[model samples]
Target: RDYNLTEEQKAIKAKYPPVNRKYEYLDHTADVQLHAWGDTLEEAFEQCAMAMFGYMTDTGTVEPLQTVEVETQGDDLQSLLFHFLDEWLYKFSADEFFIPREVKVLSIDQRNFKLRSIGWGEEFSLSKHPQGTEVKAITYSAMQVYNEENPEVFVIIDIL
Candidate 1:
């Protein structure tokens, strides 16, 4: 009884279609450092989440049969980015168990410091998904967000 999805969740997931790997891995002692970049900050942020899921499973193996939405607010880029990932991380955890193959940012309002985002994927199935790494937590260690040059974000996550 690791996880299950509700009818409402299934219904919502049925609404979306499939999709990207725009991330790179970096060196870390025990954890993983994810570096993702996009033409826009939103894209970078989106890819960062994808980077997180990518670490959990071969996102390519997962399909976009369903969708998940996560909205969060942060006073600054660091906090906003943290909450953004945390929300999705929660859904992908014990209760909802929604694993996204692709994640997109709907809107990011700097003034309000809030964001609306959605992801496309189905529930994790052992028969389908090959286990990758267990991402236990997200960390701010050496975390970096940049828009000065190219849009990019870096995150280091703890593995269990």
Candidate 2:
């Protein structure tokens, strides 16, 4: 397991409400929260992406296929997060690919960064869960990104 949810993260996730809604495009009624905390800004963003993808479907059985292409610049962490999530949504919605693995930042500087990831196609089957929630997109309602001092971030999503 290259990625494992921390105990604190697990506890946080346990506190979230279950997704009682079905996935429907153009519907942003279902709200689901996924919190990610990390020591670095990049880590938190990476974890958040994983959390978002996890919200969509099972990644355990996904085989790496499509390589991720990312490029963005931001003055702060929140902006970076927004760019990251939106890029992910764009890839899935516009490019028609769902990533199943964590993205590795190939190169990063103070104002910009690049990443690579591989997607294994779309198959929304929950390999492990009481059930699963499929998030529509990353919402900005209460979006937050952490920095060095308080390295914790959160993004709520629409589950329908």
Candidate 3:
């Protein structure tokens, strides 16, 4: 006798797969700390940015229907991170755009300390996205970025 799983079983197996987290929160006194991981530095930066937005509101509730362009630069990795976060926050405050999902790094040049990024999310809505904590600023207290040949990239940032 020949016995095997049906077509439905094969379909289910093909549809679902284990999820890998891109970021995690770290305990910080009177501030927010995040550790983000990705396959590339840009990807890690994207996760870090999303984590920052998560602090301002429920990122899960945010929709990636709208897209915004963001660009920043720094003398080094630490400086680049600080500027990147600050630029996004600035746009949130000035344009009232709430970006919490889907970010892609257009270009990053470490030699010249330049970066361009695109993010997708809907605009700010009071009833839709409940405010969590008002992020006043990005600080350098515990900001970190790593560059290596490893497949996994990591970045940490401290938010005020």
Number of the top candidate by lDDT? 1
Candidate 3 structure quality by residue, lDDT tens digits, 1-160: 2348799987886799956668766765466677776777787777778877877788788888888999999998878878888899888878576555666777779798899999888887888888787777777875667766422223333444
lDDT of 1 at 152: 94
Residue range with the least summed lDDT across 10 consecutive positions in model 3: 150-159
Candidate 1 per-residue lDDT, tens place, 1-160, comes to 2248998987876887733446666664478899999988889999999999988899999998998789999989988999999888889987879899899998888787799999999999889998988888888899898965679999998887
lDDT of 2 at 157: 75
Q: Give me the runs in candidate 3 sitting further than 4 Å from their true place.
A: 1-29, 149-160
Going through the candidates in order, what is the number of backbone clashes in each? 2, 1, 0
In candidate 1, the residue pairs with backbone N, CA or C atoms under 3 Å apart (3 or more residues apart, or in different chains) clash, namely 13-66, 13-67
- Candidates 2 and 3, the one with greater TM-score: 3
> What clash pairs does model 3 have?
none
Judged by TM-score relative to the true structure, which candidate is superior, 1 or 2?
1
Q: Least accurate stretch of 10 residues (summed lDDT) in model 1?
A: 18-27
